[PDB]
Design a protein around this ligand. Structure first.
Ligand SMILES: CN1CCC([C@@](C)(O)c2ccc3cnc(Nc4ccc(-n5cccn5)cc4F)cc3n2)CC1
Lengths: 148, 290
């Protein structure tokens, strides 16, 4: 039920999914996600942190369907995870809007926007369903807890 | 390149909107260009939310998103073309509607709204500018830039939702959580505009004035009507205005049946507000209504 506990499950999930990444640590994803949340808070883009148990569950739902087992660098994993996070902020976040800067780690902005549109095309239906269908929320929550 | 821009429709923080023509099929569409070049503001964030929701909201009374193109440092949302919004329509016709156009417009709004609520989406920005009107009499609910999916329990939603004049008393009093009731209050406010002279019923200067104008007309909710009212975060004592004040002169185009539906939409206690689905079953919409 703890944010730290569920961020650790997500990190361990990503290390197991992305088998080519020999020097990725399960704390590296957690550091990338917390860094963004803190940065937006201190620049007064939000009153409270976005990273809550429910929102970590929502983020895992996107990650597990979007993040290829064949990701070839820690850099590439960070870019896809922050794309899924940007969409999480944009769909579930209590503020009207969120800036791109903290979520962009690529020099090619075209590649970031195409991946946004690609993920929405894949996940838009499940993004609504995890909200509309409590049974599906529980399934995803259970699955994330069983990643440790 | 795929679309010839014909003319501007409008522009704000939302973005620039054009009437356009598909160069291939020669079909008339509406284009919203969203700039991606300002990394230090959040305009794209809100556009992607609208895209995620509208992909899952296909109904004749919700604005159809046909496509999303990414070319240059811009996003292009391709919508169906609509002749105008209800704001321009009110100016076009002296704020004066035939009672059956009042009835047709509310009906289509409630069908679109009822579709959203059943799909677990709150609109949260109902206002005449976000109702698109076709010359054939069609109405579409538009602008899901402030909309959100609901169902996952949360501490709170934003209270910075709905423009002041269409915001319900629970949200004015700073309620952490609200249901689909939030949109049904806005629908009531718009119904009142349709049924008089196209002018907002509660044009407050600020939150305090907004609550005074609501309570001055509908009467101040009692502890009996709304027991949790005093426990709301930004609750403060208001004068006790009487619930005896007539609505006849406020909505002169409505008979008793219309006025009854208006009072079921403008319940201060959100829990008592009629749902879109119940509203569509109201006698105001029966074939047997005078
Ligand atoms: C405030 N919010 C801004 C975003 C807008 C948007 C991008 O979601 C959208 C989507 C589809 C649309 C289809 N059709 C039209 N047509 C249209 C409308 C008005 C006028 N008009 C008002 C005064 C003077 N002219 C003229 C017209 F042709 C607009 C659309 N907008 C909806 C409203």
């Amino acid at each position: 039920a703890s944010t730290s506990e569920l961020l650790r499950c997500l990190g361990e999930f990503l290390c197991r999914r992305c088998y080519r990444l020999k020097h990725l640590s399960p704390t590296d994803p957690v550091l990338w996600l917390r860094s963004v949340d803190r940065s937006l808070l201190l620049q007064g883009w939000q009153d409270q942190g976005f990273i809550t148990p429910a929102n970590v569950v929502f983020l895992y739902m996107l990650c597990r369907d979007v993040i290829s087992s064949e990701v070839g660098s820690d850099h590439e994993l960070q870019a896809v995870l922050l794309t899924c996070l940007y969409l999480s902020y944009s769909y579930m976040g209590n503020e009207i809007s969120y800036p791109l800067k903290p979520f962009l780690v690529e020099s090619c902005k075209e590649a970031f926007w195409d991946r946004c549109l690609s993920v929405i095309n894949l996940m838009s239906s499940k993004m609504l369903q995890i909200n509309a269908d409590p049974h599906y929320f529980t399934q995803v929550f259970s699955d994330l807890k069983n990643e440790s | 390149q795929k679309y010839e821009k014909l003319e501007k429709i409008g522009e704000g923080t939302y973005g620039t909107v054009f009437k356009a023509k598909n160069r291939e099929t020669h079909e008339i569409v509406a284009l919203k260009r969203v700039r991606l070049d300002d990394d230090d503001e959040g305009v794209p964030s809100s556009a992607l939310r609208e895209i995620c929701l509208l992909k899952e909201l296909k109904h004749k009374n919700i604005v159809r998103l046909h496509d999303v193109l990414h070319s240059d440092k811009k996003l292009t949302l391709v919508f169906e073309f609509c002749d105008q919004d209800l704001k321009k329509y009110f100016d076009s016709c002296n704020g004066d509607l035939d009672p059956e156009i009042v009835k047709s417009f509310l009906f289509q709004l409630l069908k679109g709204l009822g579709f959203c609520h059943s799909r677990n989406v709150l609109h949260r920005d109902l206002k005449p500018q976000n109702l698109l009107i076709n010359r054939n009499g069609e109405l579409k609910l538009a602008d899901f830039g402030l909309a959100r999916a609901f169902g996952i329990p949360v501490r709170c939603y934003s209270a910075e939702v709905v423009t002041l004049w269409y915001r319900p008393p629970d949200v004015l009093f700073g309620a952490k959580l609200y249901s689909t009731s939030i949109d049904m209050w806005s629908a009531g406010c718009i119904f009142a505009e349709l049924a008089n002279a196209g002018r907002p019923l509660f044009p407050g200067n600020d939150v305090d004035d907004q609550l005074k104008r609501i309570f001055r007309l509908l009467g101040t909710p009692t502890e009996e009507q709304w027991p949790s009212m005093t426990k709301l975060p930004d609750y403060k004592p208001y004068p006790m205005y009487p619930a005896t004040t007539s609505l006849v002169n406020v909505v002169p185009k409505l008979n008793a049946t219309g006025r009854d539906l208006l009072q079921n939409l403008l319940k201060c206690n959100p829990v008592q507000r009629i749902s879109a689905e119940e509203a569509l079953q109201h006698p105001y919409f029966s074939d047997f209504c005078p």
